[PDB]
Symmetry: D2
Subunit: 118 residues, 4 copies
């Protein structure tokens, strides 16, 4: 359900596997920002959701270091999986950059991504 | 280092290991909310931070299901580690509950947690 | 440009006037939550924006008290106006409810609204 | 009350008047960022809060244009006032810069400011 390949509105690629233990594992390729190639992602999802037409709560993290570049930053996406034939993961995110203490007030960006399954 | 046992301003306990190449693995025990006992967490951190005085970017996720309870929700914390005599993890977090599509506008709480290794 | 009537994806109605001094004034009618009828809004916008294809920064607040109900809560929308023939105000928001100190960790909801001019 | 002169943890000065029926009117002087001197602010607050111990919901906006500078940005603070011997305004804020549509994903900073009437 969650497992598979997804793209968001920015053109980024999310490849994820949902494990029976509630683990999310995969890779993220961002189409924008201080990024190239694939980054490891790890996260968690509700592996026994409500069956009431509620989405499945999940989240994951990328630290923007790979063996090609390092942006000294990390994003977390928090959201829910909405199943069916046109599956979606609807998220909000927090992108924190490492900063000096004096600059910490401007460390974190916030946004929202919608992911479509392919 | 990041590895260790941390406490936030609500009294919740964050036990984590920082793997050499960027993993965060541990458990989270919340002192408030629809939760008891420990929950699995996973995340990532910058395993080669800048050497200019900046903190270490990191984040992690908890889905609030364990053998005791299931709140049908997940929190992600996004922040940075600040080393020093009084090491600190400063975060902002997003707590998404599963909801119907309709109620999705009120699905996500936002807040901020600071962590230190000082037991309450 | 900004002045006029707007609706968002939830079906809420935003009626605003942009003053020459950078003031935003108007009324908000929410289609969801603990709300009925029109609420006062006040806000600010950049009254001398960049002319570079950058949007116009703005924000506004509603306290969810009117002479019909009171939700003991307030939303702020922060975002930018994107002009032209299909004008949009793209926003993120923070909805804080009054809470006891022990409950303050769960005081604030976050989301995002897109407004279309009519 | 909410009316008065407030300072946050960055040292920025928030001078506000709470109108009887819900207005917030004042000035904001930021101690960090692309700003100097005072900026106009406006907002709203709950003029009949609950009587159970809860805080007073409020919010306000600053667009960062004044006679000295224009950062082409706006911040909104959303929070609540907590009365008591050490009154406090606890907020979360969103700072949106104008950007092209393309760069809109990195247009908005989020943070948290606490305010008290204690001068730094
Ligand atoms: O610039 C950085 O520090 C690293 C890349 C950040 C890319 C961000 S993560 C949130 C948003 N969603 C995407 O697919 N890309 C951006
Ligand atoms: O209530 C739930 O849905 C699960 C528990 C949520 C606890 C939240 S996570 C953010 C904040 N930080 C904490 O230590 N606890 C709360
Ligand atoms: O429930 C409340 O406390 C008052 C109504 C809140 C309505 C919210 S404000 C953010 C979002 N955008 C809308 O048009 N409605 C909701
Ligand atoms: O840099 C800008 O675009 C304008 C100044 C921003 C100052 C920010 S607003 C949030 C935070 N709280 C403060 O008192 N200052 C910063």
């Amino acid at each position: 359900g969650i497992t598979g390949t997804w793209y968001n509105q920015l053109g980024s690629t999310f490849i994820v596997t949902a494990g029976a233990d509630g683990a999310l594992t995969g890779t993220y390729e961002a189409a924008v920002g201080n990024a190239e190639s694939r980054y490891v992602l790890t996260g968690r999802y509700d592996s026994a959701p409500a069956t009431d037409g509620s989405g499945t709560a999940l989240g994951w993290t990328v630290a923007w270091k790979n063996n090609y570049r390092n942006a000294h930053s990390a994003t977390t996406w928090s959201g829910q999986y909405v199943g069916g034939a046109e599956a979606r993961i609807n998220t909000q995110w927090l992108l924190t950059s490492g900063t000096t203490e004096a600059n910490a007030w401007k460390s974190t960006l916030v946004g929202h991504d919608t992911f479509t399954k392919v």
